[PDB]
Amino acid sequence: IRDECCSNPACRVNNPHVC
């Protein structure tokens, strides 16, 4: 299991400074 939600633009927009 692995996902670059950190670098992910959508993830970053949805979850800011979460990573």
- Find the largest Cα–Cα distance for the chain: 22
CA quadruple 15, 6, 4, 13: dihedral, nearest 10: 40
Taking the C-alpha atoms of residue 19 and residue 9, their distance in angstroms, rounded to an integer, is 12
The method of structure determination was NMR
Taking the C-alpha atoms of residue 10 and residue 3, their distance in angstroms, rounded to an integer, is 12
CB 4 within 8 A of CB 19: no
b/e burial code for range 1-19 (CB count within 10 A of at least 16 → b) = eeeeeeeeeeeeeeeeeee
